């Protein structure tokens, strides 16, 4: 071996750039996503303006279909493209099967082109890892991650980018089974995790929720600060 | 090829005791006109089996050439080991089966004749693949005019010696030569054994015309 | 050659006959016509027997895979779509197929149609064949959507051997499969005759 | 020393060392002679059983190419015989397209480009191997060409290729070779191989004699070396 | 060194040692005998397992009605020229209507072998084919090499420790031509025996013998038509 | 090789063959010689079955 | 013009019995108004226990006949086991209809054993579907042999008849019977019959004569 | 040095493949054993996160109604073999209406566990272990990434696989019964594990010829634990 090509295994039984593609991706934007029962609930940090442009075309929350949502870390133009490519799948797969897409099928596709784009020679790996997050078999809530090698990996919630052990680690100190979601408490939840980012600036916080039904919502950071100030109002009742 | 240009007419071939004879004309003839009138149409394979053809002279001209190389080149194999006849009758159908599966079919009927190991071998080869063995061919015409005299004498016996089996095959020239449009006075009778493959030179037939002193 | 098939309120009732002829010359009599697909799917014969029996063993081929990729059972529009699309890539060179795809759903019910001509449609009733006309008439007579079962197996059961009696390319045995909410269960497989004595009086 | 591993590359002083090493390959292989006469070419090969494993009739280098032509190679085995499949199906293309014998010279040319071919590009190597090639004619005599693994392709009255290839044709030109038939050159071959390397490294060899010219009527056929067994009955009066 | 990474690089003494590299990456096999009288040729192999549990990984492989080969070397490229050995006599078989004769067979092997062994992009293929077959002069024993260098013999063997069979070989290769099949196979297993180190013994389950005959088809055999052939031995010479 | 690594080739195998007692030696005594001048080997074996 | 087609005519039957499976075959070779020869059986045996007629255009039957040869080898080469009787059916139906849009002019009949051991008749068409069914006659002589083999062994359109199981020897004079009857009405049967006879126990062959015009 | 699929060495060997068989032992463990009843089989998930939802981490897929396997080391590798094995499979039961055997399933698969090449891509990183019932009763099979494919009576992969046999040879015998081989399996599981043995860490995959159908064990598997 050594870190040259992805194509030669380790001494020791390892492949060099599944896991040095994997640091892109750890160290990148967060973006957090939880399942409530009924609704579903992501959103990404670091709007990080810059004082003078538009941002509404640097979005990294998108959609392939009506059901199912998007995220990402890592770069960006692979994260360009693959939702480019996603979305002519997810059409494609409306072509023939006249389903809503199931979750499951996208991810399989992207988890299989990512694989099947890192064996080949010399194509540099997609350096994101994607939040696929949706509900379609009687309104059941699932999202699912990727990864650089390839593998879709079906969780309850999650955190990704930079620090994301804390993040996760706050989504395990916190994470009741009760009750239930009570949308309120999804909503008091992306609070918690906004809240328990790596910045917290209070301005930064960036969220979008689907409720199995409808379609994405974009909210406004004035709802979002009466949350904070009910968040803070909680942690004034801790004492 | 779709039309033929410059056909040959029937070839007779029957086996006998260690042998197979075979014996067809000379005659090239386009449309009704004789044009080619010294024509060869019995390749002599190696030292066993034997070719004859009808049809358009110009695909046996083709099947001439292929069959030689291929003869050639176990020859230069040096291995000791030769084709028999059966294998180049399995070779030439499926030759013409990939042919006509094209849709480009070679306007042919081949006859092919053996004698291998003690035992002879007679096999034909139409130009649909069709192909079978048999005691004694006759193609095109002779099909329809000298094969009742070969399964008349091998009904009434089943064996056969040269000398009865050349007579015959005179004698059923003969008939072709009186009722044939396509037919001429010269053929080459060809002959293996176990001695080798034999070519004889152009003979010709002796006819009767006592009937045109009638009316 | 005459089948038909329509859905109701306990399910799906599929009838055919087992006669397949040769131009004027009946080859067999057991012509099972009916393509078993899967343990919850029915495909049968209508129009030709190779291009029906091909390309419902290629779509069974395709059902199963679904299955084994996404641990779900598959839909039937989903199904027959992929037939139609399937038979439609060779369109106006010569296929006869103008079968019929019935089962049982998440929705529920499920009953399309689906032709060599790509004539895909959903609907309750549906008969194929060259006296398709007569079943057409009998059970557009007896169609209701409350019948009971042994009500909608007689009058599957009559129309078949209405449409047998009268058109001369039908005969044989009679087959008749019922789609449960479970899966598919083979009711009869009844003759001619019987049916001649049993319902001439 | 270099500089040597391309066979596209060149030296600080010109040549390719691919095709040097290719050339001083074929020197460890079998001595390989010929030689023609005035109404036949005869070929001549030092063969050598390995220990007491072989059959003596297994993996002859006297090839035999077309109906009139043979090859009597040297050097890697295999590299050879993919060399006379390829000359056999390039006097398969003359035999198809002209309808009669391919011309040594002609035949010889090709060779040379395909040789040469390989030695070209750098996705290849070249070849192994060193051959020689005999004929015969009505109208044209004997001809005998010699191909080396660069692709210079050029005639000789008489060749060697292995080791001895000095040491034959030191005694090779002493033949008074125009006069002769090519049956007392028979016996001449089996005395020159015989000369070289009795017993010193090696234990054991065997003679094969190939044979082409007048007297095969045009044919390229071994010899029936066991008749007239002209080698040994004069191989024992050759050692003094 | 530097010179002996590829199949293209010629070396400055000229011996290109990628050859050198799979001729012993053929050595490193199980052992095999391959050997012929005039009238049957007999194959006996080795096999060897991972572990004590887990069955013997088979050598002797079926081919043709009177072709059959043994092999030693990599599994792989062993199941590749199985398939192209398999797909050309069934090529034949359909063309000519014939069984092949086997040296045409084993020519066009060597002319398989021969393209990876000069461009670059393919590694040499390591090999160990042992050859029985019939053409119509008799019982034939090819054996190959990955530098495709085949070669006929009347008795081989091929593989790790195989020189004691080989030994065994020479001091009754005049001993072979006569005998019929039984003493044959036990002359076969007399250089497996020695094949093996003294301190143990050849058992049933890791050996396989397959015998062509003349007018006897290629037949396999394990454990139950080898306990025939089995006994009927003494011990070694201890 | 050289003449010095032949000759530990023939201690070797002497001591290899001591390794069993052996009164005189065998023929891959000399072989296991070889591969211990070299480094040494096993074989491990496996991919060649 | 060229015609891709002709017809060479040609006669096969089979029975299913309890435990065995008989397919005999008349061996004219016919070409309109002539005749080939009077030797070439349409019986083939491919295993111990599967035996196939071929009937329609030659050629066809004969290339046919090489392809599953050598599918039946590649079966045995690849999975140690020789085919049953039903995959070698679905084999040639897949077959049949990978030539569909040129087709073979030939029509099929495999008899041969289950894995049960009883007798299993599989028909076919020229385009590639089958059925397991306990009696065919294939070629010219289909209308002359059914209706007859519907009186014999379905027992069809009789009354207070009771259903026997059809034995061996029975089955064998029903097989010489219909093919005296059915070459005194054909112009393509006759001068020879091969039967074929499929037990637990092997192949057996038979020949019988015929009338010699 | 050694850098390549189209080198071989002075003594041997790849080096590549060599690499393979380094790449196995990283994976999770998993024991399949062989009983005339029928082929049980188990494999540990190493369960992550609570978030980590214990259902969707796939070690026992299906290939057909009464062939099961289990995976090793690379997941990816992994579902490309088992999707090409379902595939084929399939044309099998196509083409013959009948079950491909298990050593032929085996067979097609390990036809390209080697056919790596990138020109004229990589080798795979995966072990397969392959149960499954023909006409010969149960069977069952393990693979490698070099496709030299054997026949074994009860196979233990991946990691501390060496003790793993061990302790298996030390049970094992021929004549074994179901549920003693099921309880002596997990037996093995726990002392090779880390952790608590209990309801979401292991799987059990059974294959019975009269139990065909559902090769899997789903919260009885509770029950065999605590019976322990």
Not at chain 1, 48 to 70: F, P
Not at chain 6, 28 to 42: F, N, P, R, S, T
Request: glycine share 8%.
């Amino acid at each position: 071996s050594y870190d040259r090509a992805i194509t030669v295994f380790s001494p020791d039984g390892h492949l060099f750039q599944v896991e040095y593609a994997q640091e892109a991706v750890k160290k990148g934007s967060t973006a957090v996503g939880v399942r409530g029962r009924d609704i579903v609930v992501l959103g990404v940090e670091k709007k990080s303006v810059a004082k003078l442009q538009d941002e509404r075309t640097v979005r990294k929350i998108c959609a392939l279909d009506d059901n199912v949502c998007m995220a990402f870390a890592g770069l960006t133009a692979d994260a360009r493209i693959v939702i480019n490519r996603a979305r002519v799948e997810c059409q494609s797969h409306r072509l023939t099967v006249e389903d809503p897409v199931t979750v499951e099928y996208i991810t399989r596709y992207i988890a299989s082109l990512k694989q099947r784009y890192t064996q080949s020679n010399g194509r540099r790996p997609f350096g994101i890892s994607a939040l696929i997050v949706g509900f379609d078999f009687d309104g059941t809530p699932r999202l699912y991650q990727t990864d650089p090698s390839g593998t879709y990996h079906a969780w309850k919630a999650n955190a990704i980018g930079r620090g994301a052990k804390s993040v996760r680690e706050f989504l395990e100190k916190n994470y009741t089974d009760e009750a239930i979601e009570t949308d309120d408490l999804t909503i008091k939840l992306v609070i918690k995790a906004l809240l328990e980012v790596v910045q917290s600036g209070g301005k930064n916080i960036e969220l979008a929720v689907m409720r199995r039904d409808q379609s994405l919502k974009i909210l406004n950071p004035e709802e979002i600060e009466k949350y904070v100030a009910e968040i803070e109002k909680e942690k004034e009742e801790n004492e | 090829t779709q039309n033929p240009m410059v056909t040959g007419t029937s070839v007779l071939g029957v086996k006998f005791e260690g042998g197979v004879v075979i014996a067809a004309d000379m005659l090239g003839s386009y449309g009704s006109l004789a044009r080619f009138r010294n024509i060869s149409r019995i390749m002599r394979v190696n030292n066993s089996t034997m070719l004859g053809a009808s049809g358009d002279y110009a695909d046996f001209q083709y099947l001439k050439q292929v069959l030689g190389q291929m003869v050639i080149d176990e020859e230069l194999l040096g291995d000791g080991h030769s084709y028999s006849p059966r294998a180049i009758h399995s070779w030439l159908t499926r030759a013409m089966y990939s042919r006509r599966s094209k849709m480009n079919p070679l306007w042919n009927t081949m006859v092919i004749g053996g004698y291998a190991d003690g035992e002879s071998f007679l096999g034909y080869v139409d130009m649909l693949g069709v192909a079978y063995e048999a005691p004694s061919l006759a193609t095109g015409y002779g099909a329809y005019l000298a094969q009742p005299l070969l399964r008349e004498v091998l009904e009434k016996q089943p064996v056969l010696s040269q000398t009865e089996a050349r007579d015959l095959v005179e004698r059923c020239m003969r008939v072709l030569y009186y009722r044939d449009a396509r037919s001429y006075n010269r053929f080459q009778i060809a002959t293996v054994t176990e001695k080798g493959v034999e070519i004889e030179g152009p003979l010709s037939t002796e006819t009767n015309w006592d009937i045109a002193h009638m009316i | 050659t005459t089948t038909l098939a329509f859905k109701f309120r306990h399910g799906v009732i599929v009838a055919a006959d087992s006669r397949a002829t040769a131009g004027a010359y009946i080859a067999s009599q057991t012509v099972k016509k009916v393509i078993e697909i899967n343990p919850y799917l029915l495909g049968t014969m209508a129009g030709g027997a190779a291009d029906c029996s091909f390309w419902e063993r290629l779509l069974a081929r395709q059902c199963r895979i679904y299955e084994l990729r996404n641990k779900e059972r598959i839909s039937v529009a989903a199904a027959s779509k992929l037939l139609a699309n399937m038979v439609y890539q060779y369109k106006g060179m010569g296929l006869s197929m103008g079968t019929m795809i019935c089962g049982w759903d998440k929705r529920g019910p499920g009953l399309y149609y689906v032709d060599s001509e790509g004539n895909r449609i959903s609907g309750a009733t549906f008969s194929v064949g060259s006296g398709s006309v007569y079943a057409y008439g009998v059970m557009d007579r007896g169609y209701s959507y409350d019948l009971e079962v042994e009500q909608a197996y007689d009058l599957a059961r009559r129309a078949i051997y209405q449409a047998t009696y009268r058109d001369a390319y039908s005969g044989g045995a009679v087959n008749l499969y019922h789609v449960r909410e479970d899966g598919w269960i083979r009711v009869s497989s009844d003759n001619v005759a019987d049916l001649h004595e049993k319902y001439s009086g | 020393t270099g500089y040597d591993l391309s066979a596209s590359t060149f030296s600080p002083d010109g040549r390719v060392f691919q095709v040097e090493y290719a050339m001083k390959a074929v020197e460890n292989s079998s001595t390989a002679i010929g030689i023609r006469c005035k109404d036949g070419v005869v070929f001549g090969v030092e063969k050598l059983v390995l220990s007491k494993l072989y059959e003596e009739g297994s993996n002859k280098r006297l090839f035999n190419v077309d109906r009139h032509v043979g090859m009597a190679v040297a050097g890697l085995l295999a590299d050879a015989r993919s060399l006379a499949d390829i000359a056999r199906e390039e006097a398969s293309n003359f035999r198809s397209n002209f309808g009669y014998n391919i011309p040594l010279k002609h035949l010889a040319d090709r060779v040379a480009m395909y040789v040469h071919a390989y030695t070209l590009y750098s996705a290849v190597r070249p070849f192994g191997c060193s051959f020689m090639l005999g004929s015969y004619s009505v109208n044209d005599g004997a001809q005998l060409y010699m191909i080396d693994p660069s692709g210079v392709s050029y005639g000789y009255w008489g060749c060697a290729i292995g080791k001895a290839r000095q040491a034959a044709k030191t005694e090779i030109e002493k033949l008074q070779m125009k006069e002769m038939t090519c049956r007392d050159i028979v016996k001449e071959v089996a005395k020159i191989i015989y000369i070289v390397h009795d017993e010193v490294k090696d234990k054991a060899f065997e003679l094969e004699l190939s044979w082409v010219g007048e007297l095969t009527n045009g044919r390229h056929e071994i010899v029936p070396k066991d008749i007239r067994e002209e080698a040994e009955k004069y191989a024992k009066e050759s050692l003094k | 060194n530097q010179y002996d990474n590829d199949v293209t690089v010629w070396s400055p003494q000229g011996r290109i040692h990628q050859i050198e590299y799979a001729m012993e990456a053929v050595k490193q096999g199980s052992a095999t005998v391959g050997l012929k009288s005039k009238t049957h040729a007999v194959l006996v192999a080795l096999k060897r397992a991972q572990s004590e549990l887990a069955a013997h990984q088979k050598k002797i492989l079926h081919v043709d009605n009177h072709i059959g080969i043994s092999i030693a070397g990599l599994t792989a490229d062993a199941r590749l020229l199985c398939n192209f050995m398999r797909q050309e006599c069934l090529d034949s078989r359909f063309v000519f209507d014939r069984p092949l004769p086997v040296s045409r067979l084993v020519s066009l092997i060597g002319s398989k072998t021969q393209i990876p062994t000069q461009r670059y992009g393919r590694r040499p293929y390591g090999v160990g084919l042992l050859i029985a077959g019939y053409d119509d002069m008799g019982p034939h024993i090819f054996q190959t090499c990955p530098s495709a260098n085949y070669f006929d013999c009347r008795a081989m063997s091929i593989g790790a420790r195989s020189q004691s069979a080989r030994t065994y070989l020479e001091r009754h290769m005049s001993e072979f031509m006569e005998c019929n099949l039984n003493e044959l196979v036990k002359h076969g297993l007399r250089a497996l025996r020695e094949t093996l180190p003294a301190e143990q013994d050849l058992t049933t389950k890791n050996v396989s013998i397959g015998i062509v005959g003349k007018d006897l088809e290629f037949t396999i055999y394990d454990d139950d038509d080898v306990s025939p052939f089995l006994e009927g031995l003494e011990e070694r010479p201890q | 090789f050289n003449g010095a690594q032949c000759k530990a080739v023939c201690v070797e195998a002497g001591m290899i063959a001591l390794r069993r007692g052996a009164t005189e030696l065998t023929h891959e005594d000399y072989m296991e010689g070889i591969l211990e001048v070299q480094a040494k080997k096993k074989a491990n074996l496996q991919y060649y079955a | 013009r060229f015609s891709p087609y002709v017809f060479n005519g040609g006669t096969i039957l089979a029975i299913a019995g309890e435990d065995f499976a008989i397919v005999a075959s008349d061996t004219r070779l016919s070409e309109g108004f002539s005749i080939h020869t009077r030797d070439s059986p349409k019986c083939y045996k491919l295993t111990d226990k599967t035996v196939i007629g071929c009937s329609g255009f030659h050629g066809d039957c004969l290339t046919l006949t090489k392809i599953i040869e050598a599918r039946l080898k590649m079966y045995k080469h690849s999975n140690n086991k020789a085919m049953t009787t039903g995959a070698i059916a679905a084999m040639l139906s897949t077959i049949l209809y990978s030539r569909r849009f040129f087709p073979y002019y030939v029509y099929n009949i495999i008899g041969g054993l289950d894995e049960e051991g009883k007798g299993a008749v599989y028909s076919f068409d020229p385009v590639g579907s089958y059925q397991r069914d306990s009696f065919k006659a294939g070629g010219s002589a289909s209308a002359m042999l059914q209706p007859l083999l519907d009186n014999q062994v379905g027992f069809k359109n009789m009354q207070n008849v009771e259903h026997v199981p059809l034995s061996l020897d029975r089955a064998m004079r029903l097989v010489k019977d219909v093919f005296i009857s059915a070459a005194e009405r054909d112009v393509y049967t006759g001068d020879a019959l091969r039967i074929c006879i499929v037990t637990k126990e092997g192949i057996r062959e038979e020949t019988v004569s015929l009338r010699k015009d | 040095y050694d850098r390549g699929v189209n080198t071989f060495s002075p003594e041997g060997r790849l080096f590549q493949v060599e690499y393979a068989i380094e790449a196995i032992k990283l994976g999770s463990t998993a024991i399949g054993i062989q009983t005339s009843e029928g082929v049980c089989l188990a494999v540990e998930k190493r369960i992550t996160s609570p978030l980590m939802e214990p259902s969707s981490i796939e070690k026992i897929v299906e290939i057909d109604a009464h062939i099961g396997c289990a995976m090793s080391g690379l997941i990816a590798d992994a579902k490309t073999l088992i999707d090409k094995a379902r595939v084929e499979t399939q044309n099998h039961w196509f083409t013959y209406n009948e079950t491909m055997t298990v050593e032929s399933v085996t067979q097609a698969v390990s036809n390209l566990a080697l056919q790596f090449g990138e020109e004229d891509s990589r080798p795979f990183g995966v072990a397969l272990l392959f149960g499954g019932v023909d006409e010969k009763g149960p069977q069952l099979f393990h693979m490698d990434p070099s496709g030299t494919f054997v026949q074994c009576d009860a196979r233990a992969i991946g990691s501390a696989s060496e003790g793993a046999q061990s302790s298996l040879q030390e049970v094992y015998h021929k004549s074994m019964t179901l549920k003693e081989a099921i309880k002596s399996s997990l037996i093995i599981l726990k002392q090779v594990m880390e952790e608590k043995l209990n309801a979401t860490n292991i799987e059990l995959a059974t294959v019975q010829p009269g139990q065909n159908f559902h090769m899997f064990t789903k919260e009885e598997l509770e029950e065999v634990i605590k019976d322990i």
